[model samples]
Target: ASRLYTLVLVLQPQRVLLGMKKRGFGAGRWAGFGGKVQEGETIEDGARRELQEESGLTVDALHKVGQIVFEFVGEPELMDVHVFCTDSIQGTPVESDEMRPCWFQLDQIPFKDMWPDDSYWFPLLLQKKKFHGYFKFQGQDTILDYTLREVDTV
Candidate 1:
C-alpha cells in the first residue's frame, strides 16, 4: 500500500507561503503545508486537517494541481505527493512545534534548503498551470531523472 498526503502552497500578493518543520527529517527546509493521511481518512479530509494542524489556516477551497511519485535512494518505500493550490484562505499562520511558517517571494524561494527537484515543477503550479512531474534523486543531486507534463485544468 502507498501512503498519501497533501501539500498547500498558500499564496499571498508578494509571497507564496509554505510551512517548514523545525525538526526531524525535514528540519529547517521549506515545504508546503501537509501531513500523512491517517487511517480511515479521505485524501480531502487529510488535506484539510493537515492544513489546519500544520499551518493553523482554514482552507476554504483547494484545487488539485498535480502529483508526483519518486524514490529516495536509501529509503525502501516510494513517496507519493499530492499537490493542491488555494488563492485564498482564512486565519493567520503561525509556527507550531512541528513547523515554522514562512513566506517567500515567488522569485526568492530558498532553493538551497528545499528538495532539489522542487524548482522544476513548483513554478508551473504556482502559475495555475497544472503539471505532473517524476523526479529521482540521490542526496542533493538529481541522479536519475526528471520529467514534466502540462495537464488540463481540473
Candidate 2:
C-alpha cells in the first residue's frame, strides 16, 4: 500500500525555508514543510494546508516540481510524496508545535541534518527542473539505494 504526502519548499532569491521537525517521523532533521495529505482535498490544496500549518506562511499558489517515492525497510507502506515549491510569500514564518522554521542560504544548506535523498534532488529543484525519484532507506539516515533524474514534467 502507498500513502500520499506533500513536501513544499519556499525558495527565495538565494535561500530556502526549511523546518526542523520537532517530533514524529522526521524528528531532529531540517526538511521542507509538509505532511500527509488529508481526505476531501486536492493534492495542491493538501500541500497548501500543510505549508500553512507548519510554517505560518500563506502562499497564493504552489508550483509542482517533483514527485518522489520512499520505501523504508521492513515497511509495506510506501510514501508517495508530491513536491511543491514557490517564491517567497507574504507573512513571517512562525514556529509550530511540530516544526521550527529556519532559512538556509543556497550554498550552506545543512544536508548532514536532512534526509540523504534531499542532496540528490535539491539541486534539480534549485535549477527549477522538474524531477521524479525513488529512495529506499534502510532506516532513517541510511539510504540503501536511490534513483533520481530530471524530467520534462513532474
Candidate 3:
C-alpha cells in the first residue's frame, strides 16, 4: 500500500499556518497540513508530527475521515492519501523557509491559491462534515473525480 499524510487544523480566522514545498515538485502550492510518512512511523503519528511541524499547532484529537487512492499522470506509484480531521490544538502558526503561512476566512478561503481539488471538498470539511473524494489531474488542473455522501449539514 502506498503512504501519505495530512492534517486538518481548526483555528480561528486570521491565524497563520505554514506549508512546505521543494523545487521540482509542486513547489509554492498552498497545501493542507502534511507530507510523506517516515519509515517507522504510523499514519497517525505522522499526521500529528506533520501538523506540528507545518503549522506549529499541537493536535489534540484526530479522527480518520477516509482514504483515497489515485494515480498521478507521470508518477509510477499510486498515491494513497490518509485524510484526517482534528479539533484540538494549541500554539501559534509561524513561517519557515519552505512554508509561508497565511490566514483565510472560513468563507473567503484562497482556493485559487491552493490545489485545484481543494475547491471541491475543502469547504465541506470546513463545515465539519466528513467527505471522500477522488481526483485525477495534470499539474494543478483537475480532470476527473468522484465523491461520497456529504457528512456535514448546512
| Every model's TM-score | 0.89, 0.97, 0.79
Cα shift from native, residue 112, model 1 (Å): 1.7
Residue-wise C-alpha lDDT for candidate 1, range 1-154, written one tens digit per residue: 3467677788766788877788776677888888787899877778888999988989887888888776677877766778887879888897878988887888898888887778788888767788777777786456487778888953
lDDT of 3 by residue, 34-126 (tens): 767888898888888888777777887777765555556776776677777665577767676656666665666666767776667676666
- The TM-score ranking, best first, is 2, 1, 3
The residue pairs that clash in candidate 3, if any, are none
Instruction: Supply the TM-score for candidate 3.
Output: 0.79
Question: Between 1 and 3, whose lDDT is larger?
Answer: 1
Each candidate: what lDDT? 0.79, 0.93, 0.64
Write one digit per residue (lDDT tens) for candidate 2, span 38-89. Answer: 8888889999999999999998889999999999999999999999999958
Largest TM-score belongs to which candidate?
2
User: Worst ten-residue run, lDDT, model 2?
Assistant: 88-97
Clashing pairs in 1: none
- After TM-score superposition, the amount by which residue 126's alpha carbon in candidate 2 deviates from its true location, in angstroms, is 0.8
lDDT for model 2: 0.93
Better of 1 and 3 by TM-score: 1
TM-score of predicted structure 2: 0.97
